[PDB]
Amino acid sequence: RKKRIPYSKGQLRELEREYAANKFITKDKRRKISAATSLSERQITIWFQNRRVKEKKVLAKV
Amino acid sequence: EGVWSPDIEQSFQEALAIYPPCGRRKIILSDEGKMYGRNELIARYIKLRTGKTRTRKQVSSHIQVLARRKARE
DNA sequence: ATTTTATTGCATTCCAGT
DNA sequence: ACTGGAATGCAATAAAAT
């Protein structure tokens, strides 16, 4: 266990831009993105889940 | 213990072994209006042996979760 | 201590086979 | 029209990087 790999500036600049553009993914998007990002489709699937979760967390304390 | 109590688990491990040894068969479940399926027949046997109910999606999920576990050996 | 990847246990939704 | 099964979602959670 494990080890966690931190995705680079390009990797995330790619992701953030596509998340911004749309909140959840579609297969068509996983594929395209995966190619440009050089990451697994799986990973993309997770990064979106987590990125969402980060958004949800910020709608909490008053 | 969790959702699939060990007492239920074993009913599932019978249901498996005494419906198929390894999956098998080509849809010989309907001759009249009785349209059955593997999962549903599992859920049924869980009712007949435990009394506890558990629906076809539970049997769906459980098998998938097990497969995953198996594969990540 | 918080943030960023990754996994696990269920359910729920999407895709076909008959 | 029925189904089982894959993909996907989500909450909880873990642990490296920050």
Residue numbers in the entry:
A (entry chain A): 217 to 278
B (entry chain N): 40 to 112
Quote the paper:
However, analyses of the formation of TF complexes on DNA have revealed that many TFs also bind together across the family boundaries, in a DNA-dependent or DNA-facilitated manner. Because the DNA-bound TFs are fixed at particular positions relative to each other, the contact surfaces required for cooperative DNA-facilitated binding are very small, and can evolve rapidly. We also generated an unseen test set by solving six structures that represent several TF–TF–DNA complexes bound to optimal DNA sequences. The structures included two BARHL2 homodimers with two spacings, HOXB13 homodimer and TEAD4–HOXB13, MEIS1–HOXB13 and FOXK1–ELF1 heterodimers.
Consistent with our previous study, some TF families such as TEA (TEAD TFs) were very promiscuous in their interactions.
